[PDB]
Symmetry: D2
Subunit: 425 residues, 4 copies
């Protein structure tokens, strides 16, 4: 229909130049796709009640950040419990259940050179309490990441390490840090104090671009809607900043004081949700996909190979979604790196992976709870049908839509290799 091609900035996406693309942006072109940039919300006095946390999950919060610079282990354990209670209050309807990751933000070293003793204690707390992500403060070199990995021990092997770049050394040794990290956070608060305030946008734009190139999650953090700590609506600069972090290529956007101690924590999440949707529709996918494709090296990994084929096929048919079966979340991450306009609906039995895929832009995790079928092929089809039913319920899909289904040839992680074009019935 003609009405379909007027929505989600499709006239601006068809443009032959980036300049023409900007000229074609329409304020009356409504976003249709689900919001793909994840929202990380910092937990605190303003956002700890189980009832408040339920409203924040409904508003769009995907990751709950526990800032270990404040409060005790007793405090942070109560936080975790409330978050888990609010998340599990929706587990009765598995077709609409939304998993929420739990991230531990470390205090950092200070006048010291290596992992603080407090950081070791907090890291072991995180492992003991089952945190999904670690935002490692003041990462200056690759050995800092290794020290955090060591402090997580053998049981914390599944936790994701997102290195916070907060100073000039971190920016200068970025490549070696990214290589050993699972992703990066652009920690603008300290970065804006350690380097000239007028140079932070260069570091942000550079780090996001390099993470996009590497296929690793990148978080944009600090003062994004700061005025919403006290004021019910944000400034013109604030909405612009959020929209531009998405347009830069950020996988996640964050709320610090806006959710931890503010008067508008649910309003702050709803505002980030509203802006991200508008900004994602305004992304110039034509140039973006082409540049991501050109820059990405040749691969002999079937998962990587299937991922680019699936993304290419999704663009060809205007696929509503790409449904992927994933154990560790890697298959979904590899789809996400090519920035498809189609939602990546990731069906997994791993609750940890379902929470951790929120770090990847455009990945919508679905936790499958049914016990395995005797016939493996039947188990696969049940999980694909689960993705279709959830996607239909949540508005991602309609009868007649085309979806790309990404699966593998045998059970267990590492074997994705099949891409099938599917019509929704």
């Amino acid at each position: 229909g003609t009405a379909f091609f007027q929505q989600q900035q499709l006239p601006a996406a068809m443009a032959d130049t980036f300049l023409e693309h900007l000229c074609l942006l329409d304020i009356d072109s409504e976003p249709v796709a689900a919001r793909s940039t994840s929202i990380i919300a910092t937990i605190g006095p303003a956002s700890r009640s189980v009832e408040r946390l339920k409203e924040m999950i409904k508003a769009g919060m995907n990751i709950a950040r526990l800032n270990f610079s404040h409060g005790s282990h007793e405090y942070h354990a109560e936080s975790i419990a409330n978050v888990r209670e609010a998340v599990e209050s929706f587990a009765g309807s598995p077709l609409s259940y939304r998993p929420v990751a739990i991230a531990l933000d470390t205090k950092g070293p200070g006048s010291g050179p290596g992992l603080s003793e407090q950081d070791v204690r907090d890291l072991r707390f995180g492992v003991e309490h089952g945190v999904d992500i670690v935002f490692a403060s003041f990462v200056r070199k690759a050995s800092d990441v290794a020290a955090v990995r060591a402090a997580l021990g053998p049981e914390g092997h599944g936790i994701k390490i997102i290195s916070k770049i907060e100073n000039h050394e971190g920016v200068k040794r970025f490549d070696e840090i990214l290589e050993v990290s699972d992703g990066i956070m652009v920690a603008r608060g300290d970065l804006g104090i350690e380097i000239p305030a007028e140079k932070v946008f260069l570091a942000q734009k550079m780090m996001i671009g390099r993470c996009n190139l590497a296929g690793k999650p990148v978080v944009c953090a600090t003062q994004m809607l700061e005025s919403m700590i006290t004021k019910p609506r944000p400034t013109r600069a604030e909405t612009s900043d959020v929209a531009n972090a998405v347009l830069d290529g950020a996988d996640c956007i964050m709320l610090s004081g806006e959710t931890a101690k503010g008067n508008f924590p649910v309003e702050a999440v709803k505002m980030q949700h509203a802006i991200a949707r508008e900004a994602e529709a305004a992304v110039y996918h034509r140039q973006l996909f082409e540049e991501l494709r050109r820059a990405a090296p040749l691969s002999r990994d079937p998962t990587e190979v299937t991922a680019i084929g699936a993304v290419e096929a999704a663009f060809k048919c205007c696929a509503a979604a790409i449904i992927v079966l994933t154990t560790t979340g890697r298959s979904a991450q590899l789809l996400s790196r090519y920035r498809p306009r189609a939602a990546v609906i990731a069906v997994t039995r791993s609750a940890q992976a379902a929470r951790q895929v929120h770090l990847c832009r455009g990945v919508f995790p679905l936790l499958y709870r049914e016990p395995p079928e005797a016939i493996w092929a039947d188990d696969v089809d049940r999980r694909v049908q689960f993705g279709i039913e959830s996607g239909k319920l949540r508005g991602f899909l309609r009868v007649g839509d085309l979806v790309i289904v990404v699966t593998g040839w045998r059970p267990g992680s590492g074997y994705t290799n099949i891409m099938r074009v599917l019509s929704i019935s």
Copy 2:
């Protein structure tokens, strides 16, 4: 894993180039072609190439399609030629390494207002003798194609109609002619007489580009190696012309007097084979694929959607081949339209389709003769392995190579929707 020596062959340094100009600068005479020759050779069969023994040498030299010019000879004469071609082709039906299906094409005499009386009789002859292709002479408008289609009696509806564009009206009505034809022949002999000789290259380049855009086979014909009718080696202009027809985007190249009446018919086939191999390696796939992609409209046909995904995946891993199961040849044709550097090995039970897919650049047909398995999925795997083993048998594949496998979800033509990444074992 592949080695530096691999990346020096088949003009891979020139293929990596960021500009077309840099691409030309990087062409290396010492970079040997490795891939199988993808541009099919059409050889006109006449007194010089009629004998079963001569035809066997021509099949070994690279002839894929045998052309019978109904402007000369009789029905009795051409039926003898067809019988000899079929006898020479079936002499290799024992050894799968030597066996190659060869299409049989009837070139009509031409019209007068509408279809000639002789053309109706010759077209009826073609149907009765089971010809695969018709090169319809002097096609001027879409009604001419319809008249040929109508002449291909009740039994001839599967024959391919390749419209010969030989005059100014055919060039001017090209779009309407291509829409109703299976493909086009750039009939340069008459075209060089009907229009100024210095304008024929414009018509050739335009028609090839439009056929490439449409995804339909295009043949470059007449005087390609003319001097070789009397001389053992061609001129500098002749080798250039053949190389440039391939670089233009031609699916097939033709030999007329060179094979029909000349003194070196086998040498002419060998020469076209040698040049096509060099020219195909020198194709700038980076710009070509990107432009084919950008120009091709969005599609909701799973076959077309799977085809672009498969070609994308093949480029990503330097896939040795794309093995496709096809009944009509459509699935292979849709892969071919995106000009992959990988060979399209099409496994089919249809002998007609196996001969007709020679019209498509880079399609290597394999006729499957085994009786159907009780389990359809098992019948499918047996055909995929038939593809793989013959591939290994001919030097396309080695254990450890990556291949893209294109199949459908249910039997019968029209359901192609699966793309798998398989490692050769």
Copy 3:
């Protein structure tokens, strides 16, 4: 590397590390972002003009002198507040502070004066207060009018009519503040001299989360049209009370420049803020960083692909001059202009070289601040008897001022844009000159 090998040997590796030159050489936009370096210092003069709203915090002649030194190019008078007596006093103080530097014409900085109207209201036709304020502007010699709540092309015609016959030289920058203005943008831009993205009212009239779409669209269309575009409101809002801005604020300013804005504005930050000089200094610091980070390779190519063929020698000379400047890494493009049009046409192709515009018109020298990358020089000498000699004196004035202000150094290449006969509309010559 071969496209810069000899020039790298000549200018030095240190030259090619500064002003984001490694990021500018990138083959893709993505690679360009990856190559941005915080250690790559900006060298070029700041090209995006700063508009500062003058109020109680920034009225004193001594304060205004510090703001001119900080980088203020245009002084804005908001006729929504204050009186005619109040605003006339502000204008007088601005003029006094500007003329305090007129003693050295090689370092004198012209400052434009802009009147921001109050706007219509519940009623549509030009308000009676607007007619009185527009008459005031004409009488006081304002250079620009920021026309509030422009909704259609007839609105801009009504403002031009209220300016009268004597206000023909004033520039009309239409403020787009509502949904109607955004929807009828093309018709408004056609009849306006430029546009202001009035984000304050725009953020109230349309959803706050959609304003960035309107900003990016309007800037792109103004860039396409070759007309000045201003980004306004809440750019450094927190600096009204604090000495340092938020991370979102510095980002917003940098992104307005990267979007393609010719001018950036300060409202409450300079009118009623506690740190008006610090706000100007902050916008100056960010704009310089952001201009160096512009991906000129794609930008110039897209401006050329989009721009239609032209048979106007001024337009033709402008693209040739910008192309030549990119080829040699020209330090500046010196242009002789009467109305500012020749400089405006150079500016539309977004050169990295500074457009040093030499003019005898004081009004045009102030008005060219609306054009990104145009550095106006007011020529005060009386005309030479030989016209060709008068032209060469003005070109030499530009070279001497350029050398004086640090724009030029011996050995630099400059592109000189002049015409074949006196008077406006005859620009058609481009020269490559080496600085001695």
Copy 4:
């Protein structure tokens, strides 16, 4: 109607593929033929009357193959060429200069052969403009030819013929020290596999285009026309593709030296080149040439790109350039403008040598210098406009780009002007 001619719909295309699709056989070429024709002079094309027909047909350079004939024979040919050329000198607004090129025999089993030294000394004594040096294998071979030309032969252009595998492999070092290259396909097709010659041709042309140096495509281009009045489909294709490859010059060997239709062969190359030049995808070409060309601090280099850019912007009919040595015109030519580069020069040798550069139309200025240098410059610019108007390049109302310098002499080009005709 203007935008339907000279493949302008195909030139507006956003992709190369769309460009090919838009090529129109009914779109007539309007601009003058840019690719120069080199004709080998022999028994079939030696008469003064024959040579006059060949000049009118389009011959720009006359080649004398020193592999056959004697010094007495070739001197007679030179005299006949010069006589036929000077028969049109009466009308200087329509006079067409013709270069004279000596093609050496080569070293054969050997450094520089003794016959080559004698022939090179002959060329210097007879005032040849170009030398096509046979079998150039390395940079020292070029130096040996340069040395054999001596002090009197400093002005002669050396076009190195690449005829074997060593020449192809050491191409970069040879091009660096040569004025240009000839893709000598006859010997190349024997020295390397026949099916690999197109790779060497396309590579050499691209590299010469990149370097801004003339490249000639030679041998068997219209071979059948030695005995037949019309060429083959492959032959017309080959000529059109040499132009589309980026060749500055195309050559005729046996076709003009010993063939039955030498004038018809020249006419045929002229007809095809015109069609092929209009079909060039300038959008991609200029952009790639622009991107690839290095940054320069030479005002001639800088003015050249500005002039070509300005010409594309207004659909300039021509770019009129004042040149002493031909360098300023050569630098304009390297950016492949669609506008004709009308080069006004007082040097007769430079006027002949500029035929090596594609799209450069030399005009020999034969008026004595004015007292005021600025007035002398304007007279030469007006000469270009009058000759252009006469030859059909210009019409009143057209826009032209005028490229001049700030001071007399060679190496000072730095000015570009936009001028409206009449």
